[PDB]
Design a protein around this ligand. Structure first.
Ligand SMILES: *[C@@H]1O[C@H](CO)[C@@H](O)[C@H](O)[C@H]1NC(C)=O
Lengths: 40, 23
Protein backbone atom coordinates (compact mmCIF):
# COMPACT_ATOMS: atom_id res chain seq x y z
CA UNK A 1 0.00 0.00 0.00
CA UNK A 2 0.86 3.71 -0.07
CA UNK A 3 3.17 5.60 2.27
CA UNK A 4 4.59 9.02 3.07
CA UNK A 5 8.23 9.54 3.97
CA UNK A 6 10.60 12.30 4.96
CA UNK A 7 12.90 13.02 2.04
CA UNK A 8 16.40 11.66 2.42
CA UNK A 9 18.85 13.93 0.68
CA UNK A 10 21.29 11.14 -0.12
CA UNK A 11 23.19 8.30 1.46
CA UNK A 12 25.42 9.25 4.37
CA UNK A 13 29.08 8.91 3.49
CA UNK A 14 32.24 10.40 4.90
CA UNK A 15 35.74 11.39 3.85
CA UNK A 16 38.51 9.73 5.83
CA UNK A 17 40.40 12.87 6.68
CA UNK A 18 43.76 13.16 8.38
CA UNK A 19 46.46 15.78 8.22
CA UNK A 20 48.70 13.33 6.35
CA UNK A 21 46.18 11.68 4.04
CA UNK A 22 45.42 11.68 0.31
CA UNK A 23 43.32 9.93 -2.32
CA UNK A 24 44.53 9.52 -5.89
CA UNK A 25 42.90 7.25 -8.48
CA UNK A 26 44.27 4.43 -10.58
CA UNK A 27 41.71 3.87 -13.34
CA UNK A 28 39.94 6.46 -15.42
CA UNK A 29 36.50 6.24 -16.96
CA UNK A 30 34.33 7.78 -19.66
CA UNK A 31 30.67 8.46 -19.03
CA UNK A 32 28.19 10.03 -21.43
CA UNK A 33 25.42 12.25 -20.13
CA UNK A 34 22.62 14.21 -21.71
CA UNK A 35 21.24 17.72 -21.65
CA UNK A 36 18.03 18.53 -23.50
CA UNK A 37 17.42 22.19 -24.22
CA UNK A 38 14.92 24.27 -26.21
CA UNK A 39 15.79 26.42 -29.20
CA UNK A 40 12.41 27.55 -30.58
CA UNK B 1 9.09 38.47 7.04
CA UNK B 2 -8.69 35.07 4.60
CA UNK B 3 -10.32 35.57 1.21
CA UNK B 4 -9.30 32.54 -0.80
CA UNK B 5 -5.65 33.50 -1.13
CA UNK B 6 -3.68 30.48 0.05
CA UNK B 7 0.03 30.46 0.83
CA UNK B 8 1.82 27.20 0.61
CA UNK B 9 4.90 25.58 2.04
CA UNK B 10 7.92 24.53 0.02
CA UNK B 11 9.26 21.10 -0.81
CA UNK B 12 12.56 21.63 0.98
CA UNK B 13 12.84 23.13 4.44
CA UNK B 14 14.79 25.89 6.07
CA UNK B 15 16.35 22.94 7.89
CA UNK B 16 17.17 20.36 5.23
CA UNK B 17 18.65 23.14 3.11
CA UNK B 18 20.89 24.03 6.03
CA UNK B 19 21.82 20.36 5.92
CA UNK B 20 22.64 20.25 2.22
CA UNK B 21 25.09 23.12 2.65
CA UNK B 22 26.96 21.36 5.44
CA UNK B 23 27.80 18.65 2.92
C1 LIG C 1 39.95 -0.15 -15.60
O1 LIG C 1 38.56 -0.41 -15.71
C2 LIG C 1 38.24 -1.36 -16.74
C3 LIG C 1 36.74 -1.47 -16.78
O2 LIG C 1 36.13 -0.57 -15.87
C4 LIG C 1 38.92 -2.70 -16.44
O3 LIG C 1 38.65 -3.63 -17.48
C5 LIG C 1 40.42 -2.48 -16.31
O4 LIG C 1 41.04 -3.70 -15.94
C6 LIG C 1 40.68 -1.42 -15.26
N1 LIG C 1 42.11 -1.17 -15.12
C7 LIG C 1 42.71 -1.11 -13.93
C8 LIG C 1 44.19 -0.85 -13.96
O5 LIG C 1 42.10 -1.26 -12.88
Amino acid sequence: SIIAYTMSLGAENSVAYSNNSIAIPTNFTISVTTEILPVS
Amino acid sequence: LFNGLTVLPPLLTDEMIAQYTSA
